[PDB]
Design a protein around this ligand. Sequence first.
Ligand SMILES: [Mg+2]
Lengths: 389, 49, 237, 49, 53, 171, 104, 94, 123
Amino acid sequence: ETAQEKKLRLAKLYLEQLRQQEEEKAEFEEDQVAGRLKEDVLEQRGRLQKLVAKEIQAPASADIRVLRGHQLSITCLVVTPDDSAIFSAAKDCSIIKWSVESGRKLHVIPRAKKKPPGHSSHVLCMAISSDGKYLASGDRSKLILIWEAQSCQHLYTFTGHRDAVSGLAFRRGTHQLYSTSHDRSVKVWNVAENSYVETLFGHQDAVAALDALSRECCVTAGGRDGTVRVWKIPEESQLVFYGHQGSIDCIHLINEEHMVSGADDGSVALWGLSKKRPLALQREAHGLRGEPGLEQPFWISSVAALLNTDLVATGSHSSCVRLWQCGEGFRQLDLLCDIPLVGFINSLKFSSSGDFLVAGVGQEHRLGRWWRIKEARNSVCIIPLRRVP
Amino acid sequence: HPSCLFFQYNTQLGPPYHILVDTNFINFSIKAKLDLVQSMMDCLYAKCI
Amino acid sequence: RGNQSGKNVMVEPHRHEGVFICRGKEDALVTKNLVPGESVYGEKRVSISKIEYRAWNPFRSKLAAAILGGVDQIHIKPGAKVLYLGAASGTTVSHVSDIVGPDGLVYAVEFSHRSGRDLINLAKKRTNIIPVIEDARHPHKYRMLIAMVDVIFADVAQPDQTRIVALNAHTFLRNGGHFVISIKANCIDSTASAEAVFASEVKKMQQENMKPQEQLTLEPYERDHAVVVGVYRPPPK
Amino acid sequence: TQHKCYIVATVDRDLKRRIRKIPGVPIMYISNHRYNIERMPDDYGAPRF
Amino acid sequence: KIDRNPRVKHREKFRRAKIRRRGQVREVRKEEQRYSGELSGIRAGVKKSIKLK
Amino acid sequence: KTYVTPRRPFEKSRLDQELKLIGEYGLRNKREVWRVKFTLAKIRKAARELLTLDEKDPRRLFEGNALLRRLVRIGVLDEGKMKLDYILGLKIEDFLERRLQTQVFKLGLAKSIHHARVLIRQRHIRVRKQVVNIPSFIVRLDSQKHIDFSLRSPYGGGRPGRVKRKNAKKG
Amino acid sequence: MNDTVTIRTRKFMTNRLLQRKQMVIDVLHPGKATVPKTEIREKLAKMYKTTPDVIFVFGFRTHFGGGKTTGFGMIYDSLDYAKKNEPKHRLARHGLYEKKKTSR
Amino acid sequence: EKKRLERAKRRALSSSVIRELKEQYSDAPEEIRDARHPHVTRQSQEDQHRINYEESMMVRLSVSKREKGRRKRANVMSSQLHSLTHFSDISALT
Amino acid sequence: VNPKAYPLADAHLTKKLLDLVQQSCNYKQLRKGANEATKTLNRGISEFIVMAADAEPLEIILHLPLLCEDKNVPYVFVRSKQALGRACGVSRPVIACSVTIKEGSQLKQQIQSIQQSIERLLV
RNA sequence: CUUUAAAUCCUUUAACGAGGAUCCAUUGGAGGGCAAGUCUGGUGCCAGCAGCCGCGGUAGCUCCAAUAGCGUAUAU
Ligand SMILES: [Mg+2]
């Protein structure tokens, strides 16, 4: 065990250096540093990882409300922080604002003709600020457009990406925006001061998804690259995780230290910062399809997790939306129930309160026309979640 | 004219070398006490047959 | 341009027996059509005054490239029995059947069932072709269908070409017969260089009691390809 | 002459003068207490003089 | 003027070297067009194989 | 020093090999070939001297592992070829393919090798954030997917150059 | 499309022995040259709601590539404390203090 | 003689080869900090310690001309294959 | 499975095939479509042929194996035309694609390894 | 601008700056071309050496090797 002895001795030597740094950190100077540690511990206590999986019960099809106003398949959707309105976009290049309580259309942004502002190509991603003030949408025309959420008034048009924009997410509590594209670059945008900050590199293929939280940090899915990367912007560091096989299409953060991702080979994985490889791996989350001898698992199109809890929802074209439970330490994933819903689940977003789940249903996949489901309706479905102890 | 040669340069001669040994080459190698395979590898830094 | 349809042209015999030269603005290599009025793979044919010849494409056949490259002997002459290993669909086999004529016989061996159906359809029209749908690695499995032959032509493209040819040569090839083997250097050993492969293949032929006589490359039409012509069990002189 | 892939290792003077007339083939010989190569571009670790 | 820059001088030497090599050896080409002949003669008396003994 | 003059200065084979390498890779003179030959000579000598030792000798194992990792990192070897034998199999053209000039040429950014050299020398090529103007830059395995046009270059969406502005001012 | 100059503050600490606050300043200017110190002072005074006379900044180095600049800044409680606590050369940079030649 | 032996062991533990085994078996995710140099060099290490002292103490120190030239000497050296075959001794550890 | 789809790649080889196809598309070295795949075989500029076994008529791609036997070009089948579509960089399923011979290409080592693996499937 | 006690240097950056792109790379080695021209020796019309010099007139040939580097002499 020569390799083990060298690794063990090297670990002992590394601990000596950390002791010297701790003494210098111990030396409002150090009092302010200790106050920062207290807030972080209290913040950790804020994310107490509340267990609400058992109280969730499967709803009924009659309870599910179906809003139909889009011409083509819905690609993405977001929920306003106040849980009052839903913004949705589709392949018809239009954006429609829906009222959660009534289901009527509040405002409709038409497709720009080839001069009212609008999108001339398919809209792939949308993000909304934590205060509900700003709305951002990305399209295939390498453009990012900013809208005033309350009035749907166009404000800014961000240029600079060299390919289609695929991911957008606002930093929670701020107006800082992170954007990614098929040009393998990640850019930083400050919406309030309508300025460009910097560009980050490191991905080797087209980026599929992006998510962020209150920390000055974001995660991205590598697609065909097969890697998921954590971007430490102030520290100027990049973490690389190697996990499940196949293209990684969708991702969602569970808390500040965990995330869930979905792949095109049916695998769903739970990740942790401590371990490079995924902690949990659920293979064939939505079953298998195909003729005998040519069977392949259903593609995972969207994933979602309820913030600071253990509830995970995965969407595919297997005509059902599945609810999952994260195990202790996020090491096990357990299926709760199946919500019958026919079509491609292109988007899944939990409400801020957690009382309902919004699913985007389209006849086709959000990235192409490889499948077309005639029985599916291009609609935004509000799935009510009822909690009884 | 062989296609291997780019004028006077032999391109298909590769790092695995196949070499013809003469009868007097063996005897003089023993007289100088030079190991046959080992000394050839020192000259070329490659596998020699 | 090229040899457009409707152009006057002259046909003269080649140095090799059964092969002809199509002299004109361009020169093409042609063979006499055993079944007049039919094209096997869309080649251009010439009508001669009852007599018809078919052009030979050296890019789709390895025997034509060797002839155009300046080989000495092909040993395929009218009235000879030829064993062909790796017939595939039969593009080269059709030209071989033209050379041997009605008196000669061609034995076509092809393991693939997809390409095997094409040989049978070709064997419908040409009475001198005997299709054999069997693996060339086991000559004992079709020893009933084949008598003694004069020339063995191999285009099997396998790492074990010499072993396959030697097994067939011992069983079916007569004393004093000849063999023509096409070697694709990338197929036997990709790691070794092309010419170092050619020296190794020649050596293995000598260890199988076969005497190679000549070799040449097919450089204008193929890359890293060689053709070896030799004799099996030579008679005393 | 046939294959052009070998390197000739010999110490006889008349044989070496014959090989030099053949293009593209290196010659290996013994000089001092070491092996040496004559007509190789990729000589690398050869005696330096 | 070509002597002023040694890099473009070596570029010209390579271009001539490929031209001179065309006399010695034949370059490989694909069937980018349907076969229509040699564009030249077919000489049947020249024997360019290498004898093995 | 980084290069050594050839032991035999008048050799037709050596001159032909140098001509072929310079013409194919767009090099400036013989010194650029000699530097790569010298580096490969050191690497293969180290591989041989490691191959001389015992298999279970810890020095052989450790130094060979480190050398293989470095050579895989620079991209000359394959992950399936992690042995000293494949180090001995290495050639000079393998190191020649790793220069930034030929990497730019093979990636379609330039339509010629000398055009790639000119583009690099005129500060038009970037690897990640940094702008690189050294033709002999060795591209690592990870950086190979991050070669592009610089943001300030006219080809990369930047401001048009002097000639465009002067011609537009003329008309 | 407009470019902006961005200012970020790090390692902010208040030194009560000198009645001041000190911090590290990061300047984002992707396209333009190095920002002059007066512009930095007025922007920092706007950010911290003080008069520009009591900000002293120095040590500005631009990173290779021209993307970011890093410097140090200090904000005083009052002008008299700045006159009493600052080095003479930094006061002369603001014109508050003037050096005198001495005969030898 | 005890001081030389213990110091000799320390140098071997921090050799590049011993650290090379570490990232192979490190279950922790690989960290990729952006830097102009691909690998660790002695001159880059001196820059890191200087800049960490820079943020601790709010003062700018001067740099000797021989050091600044050595900085750029490493900068040109970084995009060159000169030290592939250079490895530190490991006999002290084993 | 349809027995005519004989060289069916397994799970491990499928990932290698689809990865190389996406890499070849970036280098402008890929021909997409059944008609375009046929043309490269006639011109002799093809490394290998990748076909999808899930075509509702499998019969429309069965002419490609016949052309491959004459040119000695390896070929395989994959289980999904939709998965083959993504690597080809198109928004529609693809039932046949061809990798083109390119001089000086740096994908030669990856292509050569795949060709040996395909030939191994045919015993 | 920034730098610095002050200034220089490095890093940023505004405007000018290329068709013979004359905004003109060198050193060493080996060859070709010539008149109403000069000298010498002969085998009538030749040969050697050489040739910015002629009757009158004064208003930028080729090839090879190395390349910002490249020769010579002596000793070895
Ligand atoms: Mg011009």
